[PDB]
RNA sequence: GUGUGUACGCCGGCAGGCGCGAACCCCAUUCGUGAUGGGGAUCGGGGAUUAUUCCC
């Protein structure tokens, strides 16, 4: 009866992991987090004050499901539709600088390591941490 | 019974502009012509204002702090590329004379093709 | 002795699902995830129709795993339903008596024939037919 | 979850959860008296505009608006059947409304000042009790157009509550808290004063025996109903405007004059045919 | 684009291309082509098959 | 097992009070479904849409105008929310409310038209049950759509109020007024 | 006049100005063994039940 | 949708430069019947690419 990441709800696991990273600390936060928007197709900055912790938790979850992804893969994942005036809409990618600094901040916590083939993957310490958070999410859901 | 409620400023005066106190602060301070939605958000982030409260519940110190960062963006680390640097530059347009000359040349070409 | 397993296909437009049913304790998984985690959840009851039609006691002795690929959201959901129903019916035909397969099959048919038989859409229109009725 | 009404924002908080889980803010001025239904799905509110508003706890805009009152409205409550609403406003009148039909059923006007504390009865539908600053507590009930029983309080009535079994009505005015029984009409069984300021609010525990009273003096008194004497006291930093008790006594919530509010959380067996032989249990001596 | 290519540098205005539409053109390698229409974004560019 | 709409609304207690419309409202045990989304072909043949469950017919009819074309999951969510609101406000089975609203909103006699350039002349005729159901659904959907437009009120809420008023028989609903006016015009020129 | 219910026995044809109406033959659910001809608007088939507010009018009358 | 014709690494809000071998949909957030946080025409200032499109 071992609980894994895939068993629990993904959105609830993202919220739990973001709060755990914020509470534990030791996560480097860039100075320009409150002056930037996450992509060129965004009109406004994110409403949430702690978007960086949510982005870090979301990035780590994707590496668990599909490892070896690089900066470009993270840019493609978080991309979206762009509306431009009286011109038809088009797909637009995310911002590379935000995703790269998230990956570097994750590596400082000894949870993300460089891939030999290319890109980044998860440390076995990080996989243990995600499994433990997955166990807490499932336990809390069953109790309530 | 004596229960004194908290005071609520129904109107505000910021930078010779009247600000409605019943709006949320981020939208309320966009009534200034120079200020837009993104500049309002970055200024309020720098001046650590809670964004879930209306313009009326702000204290006097908070308002003067917002004015202080809004007047001196460099001192509080607001980048230059975000600022609206409106230098006094209104150059005359010489494109009209060139366009008239081009139209005259096109008319001359049409006349030559007619001949 | 030898392992008891059945693999079946389900199809809907360009979406194809492969379902494997073996002896087990009642686990149903799609792409490594449980049934309740499949999106969109608005059609989640569509993904739960066979079990609710049959009850947990019939799914208690089998484990089913589904891999779905291609198409859109709705087509994938319908393919998963068809694959699950067909896999259970085939398992009961092979390793369980034929009678129970008969009642379960007739129940699945009388609810919705799409659960077991795929009918793809062809091009039939009035434009192919000539003007007027065939007779009179 | 508990609904905290404050200024123009009605906030719904969960257990713990210092940030509100939901917020209703579509009020131009100082919403009043958020109250849950017996199913915990709908909530009645009031406003200084004068409209009675039904809210769904998962929505953002009111489901039903009632426009009868002309001035600010301060008390609203449900009935025994969870489909009617009783309200009372600052235009000295109390009105009974129907939820599906979306119209006023009935009107009462028998008060001389601000009507700002009303209660309803779970046991009997159409039986409700209201209170005003004109020092009187009038009980409108049954199926009729005039008050069957009235009660006199010496000071403006801040709060009224109905005890479920036996019909004991408790009224809080100034320092005084008075108990009136309905077996004999207008019978003041006991009057108690244990606060040195105005008694703001009154609550009843999950067990009928305990009764709680909060007041401006930043102190909450806990009484026994059988004895009618103090059994406990609580001290707080600011004056308690609001007092609320969760299921059993799990969570105690007090809302203050200022913004902050305080939350106070709490191998093998013998078979039937076998003959049972009991072994002595070893007794432990102190050192 | 396979047979079709966009050519720049031969002309300097869209009026120039219009005069020479349908003209035979060729590469140094010997592939023969034809001028089809003038483009808009470079002033002298045109389309050729 | 028992089949309940959206997992919570039973169909056994629902009953139809109109004998004429019993064969054209599909809500009973054979037509009971968990969701109003079946991916069926009910427009292929004449009279076949009488076999379509009435909730699915309402869901199909709410995909208008144009800006809502092809978005069926959104309409399913709207119908689910409207049913929840109906149950909260009234406390009865929303399916019974929908059936009563459709029964009351259906006109019984209409008027046929003989029209030239100068004037159009007018005659009273009867209405078939299938057209009664179709027109009732159309009127309810149109009333909800016009009530929700340029107003601070969710389309689900307006749909819930329209069904409540129509099942009540009150004149506050768009469909009841339209039916009354059509019946009055048919009556006046018999 | 009480409301009456009728059953469609024979679908006669498409009438009206533009063909929009349908002439049908209907018999009352009462045990009066009566049958008349009515005009119906909309798709109507055999076995349908019609609600007549006024049952005295005849479709083909001078 | 393969004619010898970019995956990943670093820096920067973005536009990019520097090296190397899917939308729609769905869940939640803010807004609110006010030409409105709908709409982005027009206008001012700044920045990248080899006058040109794009970015703030
Ligand atoms: Mg949404
Ligand atoms: Mg505007
Ligand atoms: Mg605008």
Curated annotation (Swiss-Prot), chain C:
Pfam families given in the database record? Ribosomal_S9 (PF00380)
Q: Which SUPFAM superfamilies match?
A: Ribosomal protein S5 domain 2-like
For this UniProt record, the keywords arranged alphabetically read as follows: Acetylation, Cytoplasm, Nucleus, Phosphoprotein, Ribonucleoprotein, Ribosomal protein
Task: Mention one GO biological process in which this protein takes part, according to its record.
Answer: maturation of SSU-rRNA from tricistronic rRNA transcript (SSU-rRNA, 5.8S rRNA, LSU-rRNA)
According to the lineage, what is the superkingdom? Eukaryota
Metal-binding among keywords: no
Q: Which residues form a coiled coil?
A: none
Decide whether keyword Ribonucleoprotein is in the record: yes
* UniProt subunit comment: Component of the small ribosomal subunit. Part of the small subunit (SSU) processome, composed of more than 70 proteins and the RNA chaperone small nucleolar RNA (snoRNA) U3.
User: What role is this protein assigned?
Assistant: Component of the small ribosomal subunit. The ribosome is a large ribonucleoprotein complex responsible for the synthesis of proteins in the cell. Part of the small subunit (SSU) processome, first precursor of the small eukaryotic ribosomal subunit. During the assembly of the SSU processome in the nucleolus, many ribosome biogenesis factors, an RNA chaperone and ribosomal proteins associate with the nascent pre-rRNA and work in concert to generate RNA folding, modifications, rearrangements and cleavage as well as targeted degradation of pre-ribosomal RNA by the RNA exosome.
User: What protein am I looking at?
Assistant: Small ribosomal subunit protein uS9
Annotated gene? RPS16
UniProtKB/Swiss-Prot annotation, chain D:
Return the WD repeat spans: 26-65, 68-107, 110-150, 152-190, 194-233, 235-266
Cellular component annotations (GO), alphabetically ordered: cytoplasm; endoplasmic reticulum; fibrillar center; nucleolus; nucleoplasm; small-subunit processome
One of the GO biological process terms: ribosomal small subunit biogenesis
Position(s), cross-link Glycyl lysine isopeptide (Lys-Gly) (interchain with G-Cter in SUMO2): 197
Q: Does the keyword rRNA processing apply?
A: yes
How far does the signal peptide extend, from start to end residue? none
Task: List locations, semicolon-separated.
Answer: Nucleus, Nucleolus
Sorted alphabetically, the keyword list is: Acetylation, Isopeptide bond, Nucleus, Repeat, Ribosome biogenesis, rRNA processing, Transcription, Transcription regulation, Ubl conjugation, WD repeat
| Main location per the UniProt record | nucleus
Provide the assembly information: Part of the small subunit (SSU) processome, composed of more than 70 proteins and the RNA chaperone small nucleolar RNA (snoRNA) U3. May be a component of the proposed t-UTP subcomplex of the ribosomal small subunit (SSU) processome containing at least UTP4, WDR43, HEATR1, UTP15, WDR75. Interacts directly with UTP4 and WDR43.
- The name this protein carries in UniProt is U3 small nucleolar RNA-associated protein 15 homolog
Swiss-Prot record, chain E:
Linked pathology is: Aplasia cutis congenita, non-syndromic: A disorder characterized by congenital absence of a portion of skin in a localized or widespread area of the body. The lesions are most commonly localized on the scalp, however aplasia cutis congenita can affect any part of the body.
Highest taxon in the source lineage: Eukaryota
Q: What is the lineage of its organism?
A: Eukaryota, Metazoa, Chordata, Craniata, Vertebrata
The entry sums up its family as follows: Belongs to the TRAFAC class translation factor GTPase superfamily. Bms1-like GTPase family. BMS1 subfamily.
Tell me the function of this protein: GTPase required for the synthesis of 40S ribosomal subunits and for processing of pre-ribosomal RNA (pre-rRNA) at sites A0, A1, and A2. Controls access of pre-rRNA intermediates to RCL1 during ribosome biogenesis by binding RCL1 in a GTP-dependent manner, and delivering it to pre-ribosomes. GTP-binding and/or GTP hydrolysis may induce conformational rearrangements within the BMS1-RCL1 complex allowing the interaction of RCL1 with its RNA substrate. Required for RCL1 import into the nucleus.
Q: Where in the cell is it found?
A: Nucleus, Nucleolus
Protein's name in the database = Ribosome biogenesis protein BMS1 homolog
Subunit-structure text: Part of the small subunit (SSU) processome, composed of more than 70 proteins and the RNA chaperone small nucleolar RNA (snoRNA) U3. Interacts with RCL1.
From Swiss-Prot, chain F:
Q: Where in the cell is it found?
A: Cytoplasm; Nucleus, Nucleolus
| InterPro entries tied to this protein | Ribosomal_uS7, Ribosomal_uS7_CS, Ribosomal_uS7_dom, Ribosomal_uS7_dom_sf, Ribosomal_uS7_euk/arc
GO CC terms on record? cytoplasm; cytosol; cytosolic ribosome; cytosolic small ribosomal subunit; extracellular exosome; focal adhesion; membrane; nucleolus
Q: Where is this cross-link: Glycyl lysine isopeptide (Lys-Gly) (interchain with G-Cter in SUMO2)?
A: 33
Keyword annotations from UniProtKB, A to Z: Acetylation, Cytoplasm, Isopeptide bond, Nucleus, Phosphoprotein, Ribonucleoprotein, Ribosomal protein, Ubl conjugation
Modified residues annotated as Phosphoserine in this record: 128
Residue list for modification N6-acetyllysine: 33
The answer to whether UniProt assigns keyword Metal-binding to this entry is no
Is the keyword Phosphoprotein in the record?
Answer: yes
Q: Provide the primary localization.
A: cytoplasm
Q: A Gene Ontology molecular-function term?
A: structural constituent of ribosome
- The lineage's top-level taxon is Eukaryota
Q: Which SUPFAM superfamilies match?
A: Ribosomal protein S7 (SSF47973)
Q: How does it assemble?
A: Component of the small ribosomal subunit. Part of the small subunit (SSU) processome, composed of more than 70 proteins and the RNA chaperone small nucleolar RNA (snoRNA) U3.
Give the protein's biological function.
Component of the small ribosomal subunit. The ribosome is a large ribonucleoprotein complex responsible for the synthesis of proteins in the cell. Part of the small subunit (SSU) processome, first precursor of the small eukaryotic ribosomal subunit. During the assembly of the SSU processome in the nucleolus, many ribosome biogenesis factors, an RNA chaperone and ribosomal proteins associate with the nascent pre-rRNA and work in concert to generate RNA folding, modifications, rearrangements and cleavage as well as targeted degradation of pre-ribosomal RNA by the RNA exosome.
Q: Which organism was this protein described from?
A: Homo sapiens
């Amino acid at each position: 009866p071992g609980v894994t990441v895939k068993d629990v709800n993904q959105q609830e696991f993202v919220r739990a992991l973001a709060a755990f990273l914020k509470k534990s600390g030791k996560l480097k936060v860039p100075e320009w987090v409150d002056t930037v928007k996450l992509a060129k197709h965004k009109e406004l900055a994110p409403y949430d004050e702690n978007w960086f912790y949510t982005r870090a938790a979301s990035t780590a979850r994707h590496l668990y499901l599909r490892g070896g992804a690089g900066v470009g893969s993270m840019t493609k994942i978080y991309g979206g539709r762009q509306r431009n005036g009286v011109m038809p809409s088009h797909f637009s990618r995310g911002s590379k600088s935000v995703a790269r600094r998230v990956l570097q901040a994750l590596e400082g916590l000894k949870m993300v390591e460089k891939d030999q083939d290319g890109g980044r993957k998860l440390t076995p310490q990080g996989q243990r941490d995600l499994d433990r958070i997955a166990g807490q999410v499932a336990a809390a859901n069953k109790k309530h | 019974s004596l229960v004194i409620p908290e005071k609520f400023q129904h109107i505000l005066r910021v930078l010779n502009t009247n600000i409605d106190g019943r709006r949320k602060i981020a939208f309320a301070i966009t009534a200034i012509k120079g200020v837009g939605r993104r500049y309002a958000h970055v200024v309020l982030r720098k001046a650590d204002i809670d964004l879930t409260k209306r313009a009326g519940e702000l204290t006097e110190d908070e308002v003067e702090r917002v004015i202080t960062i809004m007047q001196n963006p460099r001192q509080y680390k607001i980048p230059d590329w975000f600022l609206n640097r409106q230098x006094x530059x209104x150059x005359x347009x010489x494109x009209x004379x060139x366009x008239x000359x081009x139209x005259x040349x096109x008319x001359x070409x049409x006349x030559x093709x007619x001949x | 002795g030898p392992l008891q397993s059945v693999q079946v296909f389900g199809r809907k437009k360009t979406a194809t699902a492969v379902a494997h049913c073996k002896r087990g304790n009642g686990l149903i998984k799609v792409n490594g995830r449980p049934l309740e985690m499949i999106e969109p959840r608005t059609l989640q009851y569509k993904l739960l129709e066979p079990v609710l039609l049959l009850g947990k006691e019939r799914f208690a002795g089998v484990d089913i795993r589904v891999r779905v690929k291609g198409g859109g959201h709705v087509a994938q959901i319908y393919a998963i339903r068809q694959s699950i129903s067909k896999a259970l019916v085939a398992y009961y035909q092979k390793y369980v008596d034929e009678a129970s397969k008969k009642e379960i099959k007739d129940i699945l048919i009388q609810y919705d024939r799409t659960l077991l038989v795929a009918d793809p859409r062809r091009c039939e229109s009035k434009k192919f037919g000539g003007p007027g009725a065939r007779a009179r | 979850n508990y609904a905290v009404t404050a200024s123009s924002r009605i906030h719904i908080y969960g257990r713990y959860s210092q940030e509100p889980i939901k917020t209703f803010s579509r009020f131009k001025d100082t919403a009043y008296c958020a109250t849950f239904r017996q199913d915990g799905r709908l909530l009645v509110a009031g406003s200084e505009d004068g409209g009675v508003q039904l809210f769904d706890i998962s929505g953002r805009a009111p489901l039903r608006q009632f426009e009868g009152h002309t001035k600010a409205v301060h008390t609203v409550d449900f009935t025994a059947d969870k489909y009617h609403v009783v309200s009372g406003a600052d235009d000295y009148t109390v009105k009974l409304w129907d939820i599906p039909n979306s119209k006023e059923i009935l009107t009462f006007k028998e008060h001389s000042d601000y009507v700002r504390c009303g209660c309803a009865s779970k046991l009997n539908p159409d039986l409700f009790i209201t209170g005003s600053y004109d020092h009187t507590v009038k009980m409108f009930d049954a199926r009729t157009s005039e008050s069957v029983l009235s009660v006199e309080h010496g000071q403006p009535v801040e709060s009224v509550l109905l005890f479920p079994s036996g019909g004991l009505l408790v009224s809080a005015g100034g320092r005084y808290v008075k108990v009136w029984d309905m077996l004999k009409g207008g019978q003041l069984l006991v009057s108690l004063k244990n606060h040195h300021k105005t008694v703001t609010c009154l609550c009843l525990s999950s067990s009928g025996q305990r009764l709680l009273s909060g007041s401006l003096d930043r102190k909450v008194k806990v009484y026994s109903t059988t004895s009618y004497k103090v059994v406990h006291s609580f001290d707080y930093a600011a004056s308690i405007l609001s007092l609320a008790l969760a299921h059993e006594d799990e969570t105690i919530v007090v809302g203050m004059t200022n913004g902050i509010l305080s939350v106070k959380h709490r191998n093998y067996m013998k078979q039937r045919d076998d003959i049972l032989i009991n072994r002595p249990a070893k007794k432990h001596l102190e050192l | 684009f396979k047979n079709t290519s966009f050519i720049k540098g031969m002309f300097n205005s869209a009026l120039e291309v219009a005069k020479f539409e349908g003209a035979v053109i060729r590469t140094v390698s010997g592939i023969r082509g034809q001028i089809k229409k003038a483009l808009r974004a470079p002033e002298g560019a045109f389309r050729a098959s | 097992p028992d089949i309940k709409l959206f997992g919570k609304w039973s169909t056994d207690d629902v009953q139809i009070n109109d004998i004429s419309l019993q064969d054209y409202i599909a809500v009973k045990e054979k037509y009971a479904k968990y969701l109003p989304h079946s991916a069926g072909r009910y427009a292929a043949k004449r009279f076949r849409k009488a076999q379509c469950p009435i909730v699915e017919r309402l869901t199909n009819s709410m995909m208008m105008h144009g800006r809502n074309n092809g978005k069926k999951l959104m309409t399913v969510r709207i119908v689910k929310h409207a049913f929840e609101i109906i149950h909260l406000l009234t406390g009865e089975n929303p399916l019974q409310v929908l059936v009563n609203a459709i029964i009351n909103s259906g006109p019984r006699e209409d008027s046929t038209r003989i029209g030239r350039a100068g004037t159009v002349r007018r005659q009273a005729v009867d209405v078939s049950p299938l057209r009664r159901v179709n027109q009732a659904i159309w009127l309810l959907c149109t009333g909800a759509r016009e009530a929700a437009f340029r107003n601070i009120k969710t389309i689900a809420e307006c749909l819930a109020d329209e069904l409540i008023n129509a099942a009540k028989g009150s004149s506050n609903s768009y469909a009841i007024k339209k039916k009354d006016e059509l019946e009055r015009v048919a009556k006046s020129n018999r | 006049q009480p409301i009456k219910l009728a059953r469609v026995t024979k679908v006669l044809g498409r009438t009206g100005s533009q063909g929009q109406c349908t002439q049908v033959r209907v018999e009352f659910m009462d045990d009066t063994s009566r049958s008349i001809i009515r005009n119906v608007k909309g798709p109507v088939r055999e076995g349908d039940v019609l609600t007549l507010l006024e049952s005295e009018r005849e479709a083909r009358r001078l």
